[PDB]
Symmetry: D3
Subunit: 262 residues, 6 copies
């Protein structure tokens, strides 16, 4: 249990070919995407987004990977800011595996919306959060606004966007913006523990819950994900197989043989 | 297979204990609930509604029933409405019924009775069918599904016309605005309704319940998500991974989900 | 009035015919449904659910009942969840939802899995200092993607909801309180005393008002299902007005309705 | 019956102080707001919009008025569009007006003028009515109720066609796709419109108000809930 | 020290009976309910005046933010025949400039719904919050209930409405019901500071973000606001000026000139 | 103007590297994606989907492309369905594409193939087009946009009929119910589709992307808001007030917005 949860982690490198990020995977199922541009507090540029999309797609399709971690190189910044990033936001959202934001230092502007899109956020004590749109003539009125309101509520979301202040780790925790705050030195340790707890659980259940939680926000786009999971489940049932069996066996499909539950 | 679809239908009575309705079941999986108060155009009383709720509850739990027909006694009225709010529980019941419910309408479907046919997944209408609301004329209204859901069927302009003026509409009018699925001769109302039921009966009962939930989900927010997510939970229990918990419990061990592959 | 709010409560048993639950009513309008399977941390089985549905329907139609308490027998568990694939619990969930009377979860000890969704469905939750909360689904290969997910997010927010479901940890009373999952935490010895005080504060208010407010709060989540409840209440109210009675009068009097006299307000 | 429905209509003038519109009321409960700029096909300018806002508020507050008709001067145009975006205010006022609003359309209902007839609860169209949007042709658009609400009337495929191509549609096309409620001969336009208004006027004004809010609530989230709850509150003060 | 500079209010209350209406050279408009006798409860005329003043502020090009408060230190607004206050709530909501509730003392019943509708709430240490409707049989099931849930969550909203208790400033802050709590003597300088931080930001960004946040709640009504801001943004771009330019240049619009971004 | 609409269209081949589809572009800005498996009535397999995704992404990033046509090789079929859920990504991609996507349907558009034409903004159908779902008949279903979005097109009664009975519908029936935009002779399918595309290409591309996002936003909750707001942000960057932020940084000074109006 605990000892297993805190066992060391061996990161296998998969960064070959990438320029702005590092991409790594552990034997037990964690993929980590790290923004590697600390000279600029890990702000992203178009290439960085293109690379993260590629890396996240890789994780999605790697059947040994169960959880993805998003983080920034170093301890001073997760991501200080930036529009292909809209694609990336959708990709995080629709990923059937949990994505955890591991935040040390600055998570600001587009970088702040990135951590919010992640299913969970594990913050270090030196973490700082905030938006900058209105101070620099910009804004994210998509998930950056509505989804934030679903995390911290309408009063706080309006404060965050309208004033563009910075919030420390404690403030973030108190408003329910991050899931937990740990000392900088234990950030990886704690983040890896949370991932491992999720890895012990049913991947199909996580996938359906994530779609279900998205469906409270995304209208039909959410229904598409939720119903897609239902369809996938249905193919794995006897009645769902009677269809293909109808072909192979070459005959009329017979569902009269199947039961009808209330 | 028209000789099969239009094959004769053998109803079997199950109305013992009911006063205001008849309740019958065909040998091939169709349940029929008939309002039996033709003297007042099949309007419903609270008793009529209680009975309908019981009968529908029965059809839902009867493993031999795949589809349900809702209709009125005779050829002149489906249901003229509340005999001039228990009906609200019945509407929800039709809504969340995991089997298709079909309104077979001859003559009047008015007021509360018009909302009834609308709640049904499909409506098969005789050429003599007449439709419309009466609330505002008689100082009342159904601002629930009677309003919003109607708008998901005929569009906002037509829904506003139907409710604000309270006119009556003939079968062609209903058909043209998409309020009913088909119009057939009065004499063929039952054979045609039965054919539609049989076409649905040849399809997967699980696929139909999932689709019904999915279509409701476009309208019912979280209540819709509950229906849809509830179907996903049933499905999951019928898979290997969805049985590991149970297997694990029975074998006195920890569940191991590493045995299962992570799909993209 | 402290004295009135903390006055002794007089319970009357209405458990006859029930096997898995107790059902009691107080002289001052509180109905209490108690899961009575403490040997299994009050886990529910199909019979238990059929019984709660029936007791809740009774409370719903009892004009002398204004509030309903849901709880578990003893101090060790509220409800540990489903017992050892039938899903009648979903009907029960909808029944709690559409009940026009406030439903309060009184939680001592464990509220886990399906048992956790039950307290969340309740309008309010009063927790004892020994209460423990959490889901188990993913940990045991199952899930509740209905109100158990979406409605939970409307209570604690999306970050916490994903955490609660993805990790399946257990949370203590202060943890739950801090995240807005329960309404208050009180000593275990005073659980019923405070719960009854909360019920009585609600009982001082208008049943019709609570009914409309509950429907309005549901409507922010339940789309057309929510509008149905809200519109049903408007319909009730309308029937209690002179304009709404002119229809029936015209009929009784078999003349045409005349709404000409009624003002057409802004 | 029909005799009552088709009885002569007698308009009393309430246009004093208005420049771009006419405003009249019948004693049987109809208020009529007419855009009066036929020289430019009844296109509205900012002044026209504040006047309409002002006339609609008057109508809402006149307890003897149960239904409002919005129309254009003459037989050639209902409203050919905008010539400040205060029309968004007017769209919301029509929406939240507790009384039915009927668009009476002769000729052109185009661009901003098309969105105006759609906002109205009902649309009675003459045989010469022509409908359509123009935004994308002229490099603008109405992505509010002009898009979403339109989809709730004619469906998503048609709404995308109307907006993406900006064609003009005749009265028969409009009727077939559910865009207008009826089509009548140009000379019977007011006669039929007034008939529809009188049928509504025979009904419960409280019922109409609650239903309109209920139908808005299927589209306007919490803002629709606010209207509906406001009605429950009004009903409560009568129990 | 620019944020805490003194504030010069200019009176614009001429003609009003129930309210005071003032403007700062700085760009802040302040609508003050002036009925301390009755704890600043509003009557229909008060609402009519508040609607008129808020419209003035909306149309005053020099005003960027609006403050709503009650006269004195004992009450913001104790509550409320015509329900014109519903129109005022919708006007606060659709106002393209942020509206800040400055609360000293009681914000109860209809007065509580009023502070909630405001984008932000600044409370003094002596502020008291809560509903009273069911105590009287009345109720606000519009934004008064659903919107409150979007602020404090469903459990807390049902509690607030069903029991009708009073909550102090700390409790309101702990639930996320108000944005901050400051001493009574600092209420105005703090509120002015928050306003000035907003006044330094892009007004166009703030209006877009306010519509985006409303849009998560108000369905098509919120879409109308957001799209309307899009239409306004479009008229200020080269492509959105091709129609007007084509006409002035006596020629047909030509959009082939413009790029088609991804 | 009609002369221009019916001018010939020259397609330039961009099919290099594709196995299951053809991908072509006209000089006036039309990108066409053709499912090229007529021997199986143009059913898609996972590879087909991956290729369609790549081609649509290319069309999206091609500044010279303003409209996209999706069609199937030959006159007998648009797409007969699946030949495995990567198609869901493709549906999302058609939805969020900031350029109009037009389904050009000859013959069969069934099952997964029917949902595909429905996801397109518009559908131009030939006289011989046939439409329908098959899920429940073969123990499958599309409860996402296949259900809810369909209902936003033809209404809830028709949607329930289409899914529960799994019948086939001819071109006239489809037109009648609002499932397709127009029906043209088979021989003119190409001609008419290009005309419609050309009508769109004369309009503002920015206006079209904004309207498409606004129309999606009536269905897709926060996912639709992301799209609409994303367009608002793009518009904002093209205004002087948006540019003050970038210019400030560029000019080495803190941003100042006092210069801009505070419009009502």
């Amino acid at each position: 249990d605990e000892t297993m949860l805190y066992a060391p982690v061996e990161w296998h490198d998969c960064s070959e070919g990438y320029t702005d990020i590092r991409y790594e995977k552990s034997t037990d199922g964690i993929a980590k995407i790290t923004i590697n541009r600390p000279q600029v507090r890990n702000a992203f540029r178009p290439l960085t987004v293109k690379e993260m999309i590629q890396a996240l797609a890789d994780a999605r399709y790697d059947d040994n990977v169960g959880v993805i971690i998003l983080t920034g190189e170093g301890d001073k910044a997760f991501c200080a800011g930036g529009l292909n990033v809209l694609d990336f936001q959708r990709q995080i959202r629709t990923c059937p595996k949990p994505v955890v934001a591991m935040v040390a230092g600055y998570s600001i502007g587009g970088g702040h919306v990135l951590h919010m899109m992640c299913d969970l956020t594990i913050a270090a004590e030196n973490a700082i959060f905030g938006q900058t749109g209105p101070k620099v003539g910009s804004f994210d009125g998509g998930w950056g606004a509505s989804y934030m309101a679903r995390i911290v509520g309408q009063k706080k979301a309006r404060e965050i966007w309208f004033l563009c202040r910075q919030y420390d780790a404690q403030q973030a925790l108190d408003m329910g913006l991050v899931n937990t705050v740990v000392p900088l030195a234990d950030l990886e340790k704690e983040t890896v523990r949370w991932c491992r707890e999720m890895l012990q659980n049913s991947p199909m259940a996580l996938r359906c819950l994530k779609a279900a939680l998205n469906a409270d926000c995304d209208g039909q786009a959410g229904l598409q994900e939720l119903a897609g999971n239902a369809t996938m489940l249905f193919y794995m049932t006897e009645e769902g197989q009677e269809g293909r069996n109808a072909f192979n066996q070459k005959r009329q499909p017979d569902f009269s043989k199947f039961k009808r539950n209330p």
